Structures are given as structure tokens and as C-alpha cells.
Amino acid sequence: SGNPLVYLDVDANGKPLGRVVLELKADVVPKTAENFRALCTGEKGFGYKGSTFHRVIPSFMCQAGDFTNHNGTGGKSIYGSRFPDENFTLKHVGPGVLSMANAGPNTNGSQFFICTIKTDWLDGKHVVFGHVIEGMDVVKKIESFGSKSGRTSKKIVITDCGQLS
């Protein structure tokens, strides 16, 4: 058993923003945690490396993980195009929460978000599966390049990612 740690090393224009370190709550949502873990290691031959934080809304969240269309419209999971909502046990309790983006019920793919506030109106609709344990300052740097529409000012790239533990 164990709750994985993963990392995202984020850069823009080949200049580092820093590292974000996330705990995945495999104790509660092991299927969802495993998808994210594997997308970080790249062990299935696709995953987050090279993809961007495409939608960044200050005072809300940073969204990433579309490594197929590169704009919010895509992504895929290690289980197929989509997989069901595993459970809604974990809630959007505050800043640093890691949760799945979706296109409605049972449509988890690869896209995800990191909260910068509590987002409890998403409870019961988005599967929470972890949280940031180091690098919230990095997340705040990402946020500085976002906008109300969510458009970013530059390509914010997950240049490397993987599993720490």
C-alpha cells in the first residue's frame, strides 16, 4: 500500500518555474491515483511530459494534462478514452487540492486541476485524488501567467514529470 508522490517540473521558454510535488491518495481512489501516476512516469508511452497548463484562472485553479490536442479538448487515460468516477469521498477542501477535470459524469481522461482556493461546489462532480505537498509557490508562479478567461500568456510546459515515492 502507499500513497504515491509525483512531481511536475514546469518551465516556460526553457526557463524553469520549479517543481510541484503531489501526493496521490491511492488509499481512497487507487484507480484514479494509478492513472495519474502512470501518466507521470510515461510507462504506457503517453503522458504528461511535454504538455501544458492550458487553462489558468487566477483565484481559482490551474488546469493541465491535454497531451493529445494541447488545448483542453483532449487527453486519454490508461484505461481507455475515459473512465468512471471512482468515488467522491475526498472533497475540494482548499488550496493545493488535485482533482480530475471532466466533461460530465464518468468522463475522466487525463486532464486535471490544482486548486488555489477551496472549490467545494465541485464536490460530488469531480474526483479529488490528491494534493500538493511542496511547490505551492510554483503553482502561484503559474497562476501569474493566467487570466479571467483562463488563457495563458505563454506556453507553461510540464518539461519533465515522474514519481518520487
Partner: peptide, 11 residues
């Protein structure tokens, strides 16, 4: 508004 979706991006 403040949603996190994949395709139909909403208010």
C-alpha cells in the same frame, strides 16, 4: 463561472 471541464468550457 468557475468550472473545470474538458471540451465544453463553461462560465
Amino acid at each position: 463561472x468557475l468550472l473545470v471541464x474538458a471540451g465544453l468550457v463553461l462560465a
